[PDB]
Symmetry: C4
Subunit: 82 residues, 4 copies
């Protein structure tokens, strides 16, 4: 896949994760964007995490859709900077 | 391995992790499924974690059996959506 | 590398991580083995973590030496079960 | 990329992460170095994490720049020890 397409895909993942956490769990936009990156990178500090059943289901969907997309994006970003 | 077989394997991993956490650590089915995904993806928030010796041994077995299975499943899922 | 050699290497990693956490941070042998797996798999729940400067340095050494060894071991284990 | 160049790149990542966490979040140099390794390895215990908006943005930049660099460095280090 072209690197620019990979960029769009991970951006869509970031929008999906941020808006979902914000509306479902009620955290701020900034915290929700930070949590999304922390999650799809598998860092998972746990300073923020879903506490409702709907948020838990949503988080599973983000894990399944975003961790692989983020991994490919980082590998592509390595090629353009190194 | 065919992608559909990989699907069955990760599903078996999910059943194993969910039922084990539920019966060993006593959390609800929903929390146990959420914890299983969070674990085999290596996100590991830590909002839920085993607190008994048996749960700790079980969690090691799930880590050894599920992290690799989940990684292959996500890589295959990328091929079918991208 | 032969799969059996990879097995020995990750076992040495596990011994090193368990004994170090036990003696440096003072946790039990069982907790220390559980923490070692949780760490080298990058799950990192955070229910246990080093709280002394020496434990923090030791944990960095285990992260650098064990995460790659564990990743190869899981990939090899996939070949023998799938 | 030559293994020695990869070494320099991850070292630059470590300097960037340590100084940033120290100055932005105000933790000690030692804690900040430990947190940097824990983050770029994706272990993410969560015993330390950014609590300010600026620290959250900085942490995203470190996640995007350091996780891929660290992964290549560990894979190269495996070749020189195994
Ligand atoms: K983690
Ligand atoms: K954590
Ligand atoms: K974690
Ligand atoms: K890989
Ligand atoms: K991880």
């Amino acid at each position: 896949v072209p690197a620019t397409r990979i960029l769009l895909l991970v951006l869509a993942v970031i929008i999906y994760g941020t808006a979902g956490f914000h509306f479902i769990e009620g955290e701020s936009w900034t915290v929700s964007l930070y949590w999304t990156f922390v999650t799809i990178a598998t860092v998972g500090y746990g300073d923020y995490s879903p506490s409702t059943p709907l948020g838990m289901y949503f988080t599973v969907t983000l894990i399944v859709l975003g961790i692989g997309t983020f991994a490919v994006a980082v590998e592509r970003l390595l090629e353009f900077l190194i």
